[PDB]
């Protein structure tokens, strides 16, 4: 049976980065070549795996996380990196294995008056563990979610980017 990657990459809606969407990808055949055959990604960085040779591998499970961040914040979506999103919204493990994939989505995720639907966590008692997810709405002590307010006129690093993270972990294989 076939892996439903189309629902991940072509999904109308993406979640805020604090409520980052995870879907388990298991017991199926996937063709990632359809991804490489795309020259429109702004970031396609694999850790521990070469992208062009990835059909040739098999794995136990595949998990695909997805969310929307600012363009200059895609930097924190990397092994062991830190900052405001990698500390409080979405952290990768220092031993991450897989690929981070992002593209500009200004035409989908900005509004004229500012889009306040996309949210991020500003500050929490501690940094998150790898793959930890925090949807708490507890007021922080010196409401912890603020709005990106994506506008179409925003400069490059201010604009919204959609990110899909492929964590590689048998049940899922390539061409069969």
């Amino acid at each position: 049976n076939l892996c439903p990657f189309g629902e991940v990459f072509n999904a109308t809606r993406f979640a805020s980065v604090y409520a980052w969407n995870r879907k388990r990808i298991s017991n199926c055949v996937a063709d990632y070549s359809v991804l490489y055959n795309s020259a429109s990604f702004s970031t396609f960085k694999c850790y521990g795996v070469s992208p062009t040779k990835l059909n040739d591998l098999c794995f136990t499970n595949v998990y695909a996380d997805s969310f929307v961040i600012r363009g200059d914040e895609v930097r924190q979506i990397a092994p062991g990196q830190t900052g405001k999103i990698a500390d409080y919204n979405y952290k990768l493990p220092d031993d991450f294995t897989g690929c981070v994939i992002a593209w500009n989505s200004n035409n989908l995720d900005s509004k004229v008056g500012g889009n306040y639907n996309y949210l991020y966590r500003l500050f929490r008692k501690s940094n998150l563990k790898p793959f930890e997810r925090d949807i708490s709405t507890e007021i922080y002590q010196a409401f912890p979610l603020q709005s990106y307010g994506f506008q179409p006129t925003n400069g490059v690093g201010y604009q919204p980017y959609r990110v899909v993270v492929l964590s590689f972990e048998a049940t899922v294989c390539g061409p069969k």
Partner: antibody, heavy 122, light 107 residues
Framework: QVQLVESGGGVVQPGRSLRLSCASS????????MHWVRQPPGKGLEWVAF????????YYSDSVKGRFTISRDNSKNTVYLQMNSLRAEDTALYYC???????????????WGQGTLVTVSS | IVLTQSPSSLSASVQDRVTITCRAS??????LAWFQQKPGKAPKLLIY???NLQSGVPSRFRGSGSGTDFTLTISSLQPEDFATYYC?????????FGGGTKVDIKR
């Protein structure tokens, strides 16, 4: 195959209103953003307006903001440009073009209709 | 965003290398596109994302640049390449076109 056909152009007096239409065929209109760009006679290309695939996002050039309104009817495969308070400087061939930029597979301004000529004159 | 497209016109001969420059008034990453237009005809996309060739566009059209300064090069000009070329930045609203470059025949 992919087709974009603009209609509605004509000769109108300044201060009057005019509505342009762009009818698509041969592709999934509902997931493409649409743009209007105009080309005044003997001049270059000038972006006018944008409407996202839903119709929820949308923007105008400074030269038409407040006078023009863009809309679409995905059930009829068409995008519209309502032009109010027309002025001599709006005289131009008005093109419609599709845009899938923002989708991971997207390409900007990859197909254009042949345009409909708008002439504002007394 | 203002796009400064240079030169505004040039004369060239078949088999020549043509270089057209587009400079943005602020950084736009690689979100620049190049178009060709012939008289009476609609524009045709040549390159998007600053360097990706549109399908069906010959390989003699190359685009380069990121940030502010961009280049379109036609490596070996062919008779069907005489035309007007436009650069465009398509991600930062309001959308913007360069001033055009008309490539005519040298004699």
């Amino acid at each position: 195959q992919v087709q974009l056909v603009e209609s509605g152009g004509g000769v109108v007096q300044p201060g009057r209103s005019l509505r342009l239409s762009c009818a698509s065929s041969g592709f999934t209109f509902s997931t493409y953003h649409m743009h209007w760009v105009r080309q005044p006679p003997g001049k270059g290309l000038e972006w006018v307006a944008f409407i996202s695939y839903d119709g929820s996002n949308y923007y105008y050039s400074d030269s038409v903001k407040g006078r023009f309104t863009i809309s679409r009817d995905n059930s009829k495969n068409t995008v519209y440009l309502q032009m109010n308070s027309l002025r001599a400087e709006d005289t131009a061939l008005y093109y419609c073009a599709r845009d899938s930029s923002g989708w991971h597979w997207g390409v900007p301004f990859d197909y254009w209709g042949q345009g409909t000529l708008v002439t504002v004159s007394s | 965003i203002v796009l400064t497209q240079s030169p505004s016109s040039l004369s060239a001969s078949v088999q020549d290398r043509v270089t057209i420059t587009c400079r943005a008034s602020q950084v736009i990453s690689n979100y620049l596109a190049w178009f060709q237009q012939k008289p009476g005809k609609a524009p045709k996309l040549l390159i998007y994302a600053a360097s990706n060739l549109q399908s069906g566009v010959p390989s003699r059209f190359r685009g380069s640049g990121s940030g502010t300064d961009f280049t379109l090069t036609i490596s070996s000009l062919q008779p069907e390449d005489f035309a007007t070329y436009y650069c465009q930045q398509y991600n930062i609203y309001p959308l913007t076109f360069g001033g055009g470059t008309k490539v005519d025949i040298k004699r």
